[PDB]
Symmetry: C3
Subunit: 150 residues, 3 copies
């Protein structure tokens, strides 16, 4: 196995429960969603940061193990135009579990974003034999959220 650690704290929610078609319908990948309860978006895997949305609310990352994931803060967050998010990492940077990628203002975003539901999805499902989704409360950079068999 490969294990995916929480990129942010909160409660695990099912992907299907996110009020967005692209995510609920697994169009991008399968995974879990987290209802945030904190203030930083950390690396869930050991690897290399891929992309960082100019609005700083989403990023990708490819693990050393060949796992490609995408983390997206909230639904329609692009509206905020960047407000509420501070980018700590750089596209390309090599990181380790627990490493800070983005810092965010939870109370602001919470009052001005359609949703704070954060999808954590596996972009390369086809490389994926088994996907196990855990549940419950998770804490940033520690608690495992998903387990995959390559």
């Amino acid at each position: 196995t490969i294990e995916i650690i929480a990129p942010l704290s909160g409660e695990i929610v099912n992907i299907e429960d996110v009020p967005d078609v692209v995510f609920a319908e697994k169009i991008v990948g399968d995974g879990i969603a987290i209802k945030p309860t904190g203030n930083k978006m950390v690396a869930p895997v050991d690897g290399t940061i891929g992309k960082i949305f100019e609005t700083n609310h989403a990023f990708s990352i490819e693990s050393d193990s060949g796992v490609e994931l995408f983390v997206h803060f909230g639904i329609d967050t692009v509206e905020l135009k960047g407000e509420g998010f501070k980018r700590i990492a750089e596209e390309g940077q090599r990181v380790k579990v627990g490493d800070t990628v983005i810092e965010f203002d939870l109370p602001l975003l919470e009052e001005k974003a359609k949703s704070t539901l954060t999808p954590v999805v596996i972009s390369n499902m086809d490389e994926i034999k088994e996907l196990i989704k855990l549940s419950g409360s998770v804490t940033v950079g520690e608690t495992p959220v998903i387990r995959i068999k390559k």
Copy 2:
């Protein structure tokens, strides 16, 4: 055949005519879209309700016949955050054609939603040999909107 009855009244529009890429480009499935003219979103098939958006503007349903459909009210409706929609059914509930799923305020939604165009799409196209799209005016729980050959 399997036949899909109108989940809401109005005029049938083509999927391709919905000003949303995910829908117009058939990324989720193929189907028709309806320009609503009434106030309730009903079950189009006999079956089991799957998912209900927390914003109450969209739902899924799997027919007994193995047809999986998704009905989404308007474009970007998640903005409304629930305003305008009353949920009559429960995730999991077993329903029959004509059974009420959601009640909505047509004049409010009409004045505050990007679009009221309602996509009715077949999520499991791959199980689908033939899809026939009807046209014209449809009336809630009565008029057939699509016909499929499994």
Copy 3:
């Protein structure tokens, strides 16, 4: 080869750089994105106009050579509800490179749209053996943006 000419001026940006999941993640097709610098959206290929968004901010077109492309102005442009866009062409019309499809108000759209990033994507990738993406500054109806091998 088949070559795709700029449907609008500006700077070529990578698809992956567009702050929208559907586009960044290549869910609709692959291509480039342009940061506009002008005022008209022109035909990139010789062919037949397919679809025009009712909000006039996006269109499709199928080249005589079998290339199917989709051009979408900005991110979430459907909000504007049409403001800022003037439609010069008709669904179905046969056009030639450089032919005007839509006229747009750059300074207005620029102040009221989430983004002006314009994705130019190839919808029928599967028909595509090679896709080459050029870079730099492009000028409406002249500069080639992509080159494909069918």
